Every structure is written in C-alpha cells, then in structure tokens.
C-alpha cells in the first residue's frame, strides 16, 4: 500500500528532526524574540510511517495538519510555518547523552516547530532553546516531538 | 514478517508510555530521592514497530537493550529496571496542551524510564518530575522519549 506522504500530518504523529550544523540565534521573531537553534539542511521524519524528506525539499504551503494548512506568521517580511506539538520539543546533541532544553523549561506551555520557507528550495528549521547549552554552533542536534492539535 | 517484540529494544528506538491515573511521589529511590509521576496500569508502545504491551504484563528480567539486559538497582529491597533515554523524557497531560517538565530541567543530563517489578503481574512505571505541575493525581499522562545507549 502507498505510504502516507510527509506533507500530510495528523495529530499524535511522532516527529523526528535532524539539525546538522545547527547555529544559535539570540532572538527569533516566530518565538517572540527568544533564542533558537536553526539548521540549513534539516531533515524531517515521520517515525510511525517511516517517511522522510529534507526540509528544504518540502513545499511548505502544501503541508496539511488534520487536513488543514499549517498556521502562518509573517514576521518582518518573512513567512514562517508552524507545526504544533503535544508537549515540549526534546532535543539533544547527536550521538551524545548531552541533552538541551527549551526556553519555557519552567512553564507548562507546549512547544512548536517553526519553518522559514522562501517559496523555492531554501528552508530553515527552528527549534526553541534557552541558551547555548549545546554550544554556539555548528552542532548536530536531534529533536523529538509529538504533533499537537490544529491552532485555534 | 514477525514483528519485533516489545521486550527487545534498540538504541534510537522511540518509546510511547501511557500513565493512566498517575500519582505524584515526593521522592523516588531510583531517581535519587526526587519527585516522580507513577502509574499502576501503564502501557508502553514502540512507535516505529507499532508493538505494545501493558507494563505489568512484561517480564522485565527478559527485556534486552541492544541484546543486553537492562540495568538493575536494588533500592530498599525493591528491584528497579532502567530504560535509558537519549535526551529528556517529554510528558504532558493526556488530551491537553498542558505539558509537564522533569526534575533536571536546567541541567543537560538525559532522562530514564524506571520500572518496578515484583516478579509477577504487578509493575510500576516511573517518570521524572519536578513538582505537581500536572496535579497531585490521579491524572492521565503521555510520555515520549528516544532510547539511549546501554549504561556503562
């Protein structure tokens, strides 16, 4: 049977994100001027289905969650796409027990995956972070999360 | 064609744990006298393989990670089994965006899944927590994590 494409997402899906050479950003507009780790050649995997793709290779205006398009936020002329999560995003340094933490480590708020797309073949994947606990970069980071409900 | 049994685990496996009617413990011996959320009827799922089982229905002396038996800690006469994780354990209130956090929420350490077994059909699953951010209990909790390397 044909596999479910990585473009189509459902609530409760387990997401696996690779962030090769991730760099540190002091303030990200999509996360309310908060630190983030971002990669230029990130890879997204649906763990249950096994499907995969490079973030730059996905047409992000066609990605649907529960049959509905992802939420869009235009910040300073840059269009960002949101993938909500149930819970926080769990990310760590590749191949090491060293494990990072997000900005809202104290709070009870869930996390989200943010993608910047230029409409072509250039996409940036952002994950929330508090400080440079995994280094200033470049650093290979693997993140895990569970897809949340559609924003209301 | 035969599926990989949930008794046999590998590094990089994605784990899905359900904690129905989870209770709060102020101090747990397996986590060095630190708060934890525990359930009596927990369910464990290997997300990639789709296999599942009740925690109480698993013979935990037969569970192998990378072909090796799980690490055991005898604490006050109670035998605990450890499932190491890559990164932290991500848990949230089931069905809600409300997301809990672990004890070492500023540290860079990874988390672990702790199981108490009596040798019969009674098993307790423990997940690290800092305070009663999800309530004193009972509360339904869903946890997600990636299996780490064997303890050395």
């Amino acid at each position, epitope marked *: 049977a044909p596999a479910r494409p990585i473009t189509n997402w459902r609530s409760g899906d387990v997401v696996w994100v690779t962030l090769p050479s991730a760099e540190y950003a002091q303030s990200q507009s999509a996360m309310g001027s908060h630190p983030a780790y971002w990669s230029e050649e990130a890879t997204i995997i649906n763990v249950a289905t096994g499907q995969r793709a490079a973030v730059s290779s996905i047409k992000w205006d066609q990605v649907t969650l529960n*049959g509905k398009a992802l939420h869009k936020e235009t910040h300073s002329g840059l269009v960002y796409y949101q993938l909500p999560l149930m819970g926080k995003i769990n990310f760590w340094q590749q191949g090491t027990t060293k494990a990072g933490y997000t900005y809202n480590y104290n709070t009870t708020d869930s996390d989200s995956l943010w993608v910047w797309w230029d409409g072509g073949s250039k996409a940036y994947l952002y994950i929330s972070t508090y400080t440079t606990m995994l280094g200033a970069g470049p650093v290979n980071i693997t993140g895990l999360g569970a897809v949340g409900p559609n924003p209301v | 064609a035969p599926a990989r049994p949930i008794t046999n685990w590998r590094s990089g496996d994605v784990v899905w744990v359900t904690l129905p*009617s989870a209770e709060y413990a102020q101090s747990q011996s397996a986590m060095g006298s630190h708060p934890a959320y525990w359930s009596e009827e927990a369910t464990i799922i290997n997300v990639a393989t789709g296999q599942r089982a009740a925690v109480s229905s698993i013979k935990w002396d037969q569970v192998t990670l990378n072909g090796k038996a799980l690490h055991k800690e005898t604490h006050s006469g109670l035998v605990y089994y450890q499932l190491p994780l890559m990164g932290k354990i991500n848990f949230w209130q089931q069905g809600t965006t409300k997301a809990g956090y672990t004890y070492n929420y500023n540290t860079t350490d990874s988390d672990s899944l702790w199981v108490w077994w009596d040798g019969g059909s009674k098993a307790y699953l423990y997940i690290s927590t800092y305070t009663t951010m999800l309530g004193a209990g009972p509360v339904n909790i869903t946890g997600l994590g990636a299996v780490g390397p064997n303890p050395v």
Partner: antibody
Amino acid sequence: QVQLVQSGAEVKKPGSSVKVSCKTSGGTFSTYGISWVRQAPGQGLEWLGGIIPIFATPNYAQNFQGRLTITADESTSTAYMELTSLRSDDTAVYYCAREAQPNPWFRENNRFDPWGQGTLVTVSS
Amino acid sequence: QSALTQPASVSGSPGQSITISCTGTSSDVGSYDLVSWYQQQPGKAPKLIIYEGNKRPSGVSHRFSGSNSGNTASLTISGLQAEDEADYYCCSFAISVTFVFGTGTKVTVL
C-alpha cells in the same frame, strides 16, 4: 472476543443534551479507536465522530462541529459521546464501534469490526 | 463534505451476481483500495463483511468480493439468497480525520 456495551435508551426533550457511554469488556482500549455512528429511523448510517484514546484528540464531522464531544476513559474502559442542543431530527439509534486497526497511525486503513448494541435516543415530548 | 454515492436500489434473481458501486469526489475520500463494506439486516446492528478493499473477516461468507477501479469501489455478491436481502454501506477515510459512509444500497430478490 471483545464486547462493546452501550447505555440504555433515553428520551429527551428538544434543546436538551444527552450522553451515551460505550463499555469495553473482555479487554482494554489499548491503541485502538472508538467511533460513533447514528442511524435515523428509515435512513442510512452517518458517522458522527471518533477518537484514539492514547492520542485523546477527538475529531468530528462538519455537521456536528461545535455540538458533539467525544471522550474516552482509560481507568474504566468506557468511551463517551455528548450531543447538545437536541432537535427532533436527532432521534436515531446511536452506535459505538471499535476501529479495528492496531496501529493508531495508518488510521486510513481501518474497519469497524465489533459494533455496540445501539442506544436509541428520542427527542420529542 | 460530499458523501459517497451508492446505487440505492439493486436487485437480482436467486443465484446470479450483483455489484454495488461506491463513487466519491475529491481526494478527501482516500484511496479506493482501502474501502470497507458493511451489511445491516433489518432490525440488527451493522456488521463488517469486507474491509481493506477485498479482505474478508472471519466467518463472513466467501460470496462477498470487493474490487477497486479508479474513483469507484465495488462490492460483488455471488449466489443471491434470501439472507442477502439487506442494506449495504461503504465507508472510507478522509484527508480531514473523519469517516464518510455511503448513501446505502438495498438488495432485493425478484
């Protein structure tokens, strides 16, 4: 053989709300799904909504969005549906059914192998 | 969302074969190789006869066969008998996380 047992038939006045429970005996919810289907007298089957208990993120049909709520309990293997603002055309036999697909993902490949006995709700006076 | 169109009335003599179609529109009805079929005799709860295109559950009579051709899923009943005089429905998954039931078909014996 797992069994799905529903609550008894109810009669409600227009504008009220009803709650039908589905009981799972011979097993647990595990990672399966629960769907609610109603059949008005003399008409066909209409899918109301469904849920996967481990996901606990219910989704409903367009006609019942903002009017139907579906919840599942893991401590007691009971699934619930709640329809508010009842009208005369809500009179139907409501069925609880199990989505016989072990993987919560791959939910497109699914079937309703066991069906509940059916609860008849009458909305009149 | 538009429902699945079904041939409301289908009839056949005892012994022949009949085919019930299930036609939909849009990609929101999913692939037709994964359409399930149910049978509802008068006064009874619906029961599954064909699922996953052409897979039969245990105890279902081997006279029920399911096909798939483009945007139409077909259920075929061979050797019509008095116990096949019931109502049959097709169901499928949607791009939105929902299930759509067919309009329903009544089988009659001449």
